[PDB]
Write a protein that binds this DNA or RNA. Sequence first.
RNA 1: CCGA
RNA 2: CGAGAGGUACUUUUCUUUUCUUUCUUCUUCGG
Lengths: 113, 241, 269, 186, 142, 119
Amino acid sequence: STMKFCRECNNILYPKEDKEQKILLYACRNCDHQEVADNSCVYRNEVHHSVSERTQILTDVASDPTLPRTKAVRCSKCQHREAVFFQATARGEEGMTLFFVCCNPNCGHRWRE
Amino acid sequence: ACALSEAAYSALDQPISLLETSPLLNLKNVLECGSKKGQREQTMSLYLSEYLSKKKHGFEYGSLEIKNHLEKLSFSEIVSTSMIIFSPVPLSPWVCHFHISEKVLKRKQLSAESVVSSLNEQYKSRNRELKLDIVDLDIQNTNHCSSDDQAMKDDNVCITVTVVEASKHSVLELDAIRLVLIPFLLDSPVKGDQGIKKVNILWTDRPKAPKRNGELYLKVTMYGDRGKRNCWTALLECLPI
Amino acid sequence: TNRSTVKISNVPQTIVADELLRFLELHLGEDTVFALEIPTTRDNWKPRDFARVQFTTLEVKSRAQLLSSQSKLLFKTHNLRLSEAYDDIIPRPVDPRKRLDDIVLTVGFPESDEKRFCALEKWDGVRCWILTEKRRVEFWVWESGDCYKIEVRFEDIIETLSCCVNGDASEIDAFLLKLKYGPKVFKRVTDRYRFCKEDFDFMWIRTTDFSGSKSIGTSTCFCLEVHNGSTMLDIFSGLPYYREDTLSLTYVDGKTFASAAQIVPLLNA
Amino acid sequence: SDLQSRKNLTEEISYGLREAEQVCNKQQLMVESWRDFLAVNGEDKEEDSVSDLARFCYERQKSATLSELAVSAFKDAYRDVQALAYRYGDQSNSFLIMSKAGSKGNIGKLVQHSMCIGLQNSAVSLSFGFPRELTCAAWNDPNSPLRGAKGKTTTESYVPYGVIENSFLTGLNPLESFVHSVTSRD
Amino acid sequence: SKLPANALSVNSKEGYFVKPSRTNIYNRVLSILGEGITVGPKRFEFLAFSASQLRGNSVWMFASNEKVKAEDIREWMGCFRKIRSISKCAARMGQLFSASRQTLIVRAQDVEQIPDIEVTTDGADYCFSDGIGKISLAFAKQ
Amino acid sequence: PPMDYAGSRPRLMDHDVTLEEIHKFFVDYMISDTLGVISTAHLVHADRDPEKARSQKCLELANLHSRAVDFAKTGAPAEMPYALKPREFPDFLERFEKPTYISESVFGKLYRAVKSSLA
RNA sequence: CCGA
RNA sequence: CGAGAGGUACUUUUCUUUUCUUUCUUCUUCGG
Ligand SMILES: [Zn+2]
Ligand SMILES: [Zn+2]
């Protein structure tokens, strides 16, 4: 994906590996010139999966799913049954522990497993 | 039929939201359900066993361990920077470098060797990639690669993909490796199976197929099988769980 | 007769605290209501069916109870019914003489074998609220803007004296307190249904010593320097273990014991 | 009954809508991206994630699931806002009589008649959003979702979400009337 | 008296959810546990605390002298690096603090590890050899 | 039938103890310690409520007691909820400050049987 | 003070 | 007799108790 320009031809260059020298060279297709490459990088791409441009916000693409809710528990502050549960890690623990978030709009309480 | 048509005229012909539909369209899709084809959706609904309630918050842990096992997670959603580095028996001039941060592997409950094993499990079982006269494809996991291009992440791992050539230079072209080899392993899952779109956990009060004597259940959405195999017969092979 | 905070049974839910305040000040005397609080289920837009009102004296509280028992409090076609509350809205003693304002508070301990007193630090312009019903006394010591409530219980005081700074026996201007235990130190940290008549919209949290020289942790004896103690002897006689005797003292200079460690009452080894 | 009761009613509606907006902003955090923030740990952006009052409204309209979890989060917090017609309204009110009798209308029509219209949303994906204020300064904002792509990289579609603080008695703004016309054209 | 839950770590709802706020008593007790007290020409460091000292809010303290220090008396009990917990690593340092009467020392060659027994019925793990052991007739006399 | 015996999940760290987490566990043992109220609330909720030791408010307190006695073992607090405190004490207590009420259970009879003996 |  | 136009004609057609929690800082239980 990385493109360079010719020195005298001022055209595009193509990567050409020399089999007799075991090095990387950039050769101009129009003019007879073989420039020395640098850092052996011929491709670089930040992987972005946005292949549906100007169409991902119309239909629900679901690139950020919701957290599941359970009603077989009870909060500490309020006596509500509905609560949001998910899985994450602590600040210094090793593994994955279950967390809970209350669904009541006036409770504002969260607790671990 | 008159008692159903009278409920059909006196129904809301406007959708509630973009995810749900109108109560008229919901009655039309239920009544006209014998179309025996269409949209290749095939939505399933799995339940949980009775012995999972013997542990503290056993149902939530069981549903989360199911949704972590049978949900598709592609390799492109884990990587952050892909590159092709001219490394030079070497036997291959082009080596595909895939750099993965160490946070997304712990967030998705993965490791540096499990992604190599699952990449090999899709390379050795899917011949849908075009033939570049490839006899082998070894993947070497390395936590610190010597590619002096951009030292911007000192706490990430690297994945080197090397193609085995048959003592010639018929594979050493850059355009074919850039266009065929890179999107083949980037669209391969490292978690779950290929034919499952999305799995969500839902809570219900009056569920279909009731028990003997409110519960949590999962709703699995599978892709349309182009072959003769059914979606249920591919959902059954749920063989570890 | 212990507290003056009154709970109204049925207030309308379409009012604000100013409409109830003006009604109570129209039926009773002018500015005779100290605190008023309507509890809300939501944050600021859903008041409840009851409210708490705190008056300034007991006579206006008994007059409001007599007006409520005779059904003479009609506020927007609602007959107000008074009852008894659980606690005061503000922990303030209902007495015009017990609220000592702008007095001198000093700390220390007896230095020599006589009844002398060496002062480490001096606090000017502090408050003094003697809570007889709650059985405690509290001071408001302002320092660098913020104030610090110093709660002293009745069980911690073991000797109450009556001293005199100016030398004359008739000029009783000091009250010496002897604390067995230590006092509780608090700190002030930083709107429509509360009138409250003053600046009381904050909260108290228990913190450590606020002084830079840390004098309070080694301050088992107190000395309440008052402006003019003549009729305050009837109030200070309610303090437990009060020795009914006048005794002089000597104000020794005591700024030598100035440590910066967390463990204050230690001798310099 | 008088002017002070109407002023207290408007001051209660203006705080109930502000509390319902905070309820929706709290409920919008229940996704798989804020799992490190929802857990009981030490977050550095805990004071910088709550002050985003316009970014939350922009993210609610660009996606279809965040608007679906916010319509249901507004519709249950609005049940306490709709419960103010029984405190302030009298027993001789004709709308309350016709709503409790069940002959014609309900309390949702009386709230839009007297206090506030409330939630105005459409189930169709349009190419413009609502600027969360419905005032004169919100219409002249160049970085508003009403114009088009706000630049947060461009935008293509919106799910319209807007709350009208006015009612059918005090009169609507022309921007609020445009919002009501868009949400009632369907 | 006993320190309550309101004299330190006072709750305060800030933001969306409630959060406990640590007052100056929290940072005082932490500074006392970390640095120590300094009376006389000595300084007491945190050794450990027992199982009943945790409920009674007490702790043991030791002064680093010329012979031994606070770390040497801690490693003389054992090695606590194989415990990755925060509560169990503190609970196993108070296990060797019971009011006991000493007896003779058994050498390291006199160990015999019997394989234990356990049952697993209906998916629930059980065990019969929780802390039991065997001893001889004459060893009870000695 | 008996109750469950497995407690909470243990909390393992990815590093070694730096002798400050023990200080934090010792200081945070004072807060969130509701071991003194569970056995009291169970004893009052068995006196005031019929079908005692078999109602739901007794089973939640019996689970919270088994979770609170493991607070010295694992770092999982009890978290005694609201709407479970009795706010009213029976006759067989020494709490002369709370608004108590005459107990009709066997404990009130056993408390009165010693006042009938010390008379 | 110590042991569930 | 067929085509093109405009018009009458689905009106709220299902929101639920309107009484749901802040009077808070309070003894773990057993045996040496
Ligand atoms: Zn809750
Ligand atoms: Zn690399």
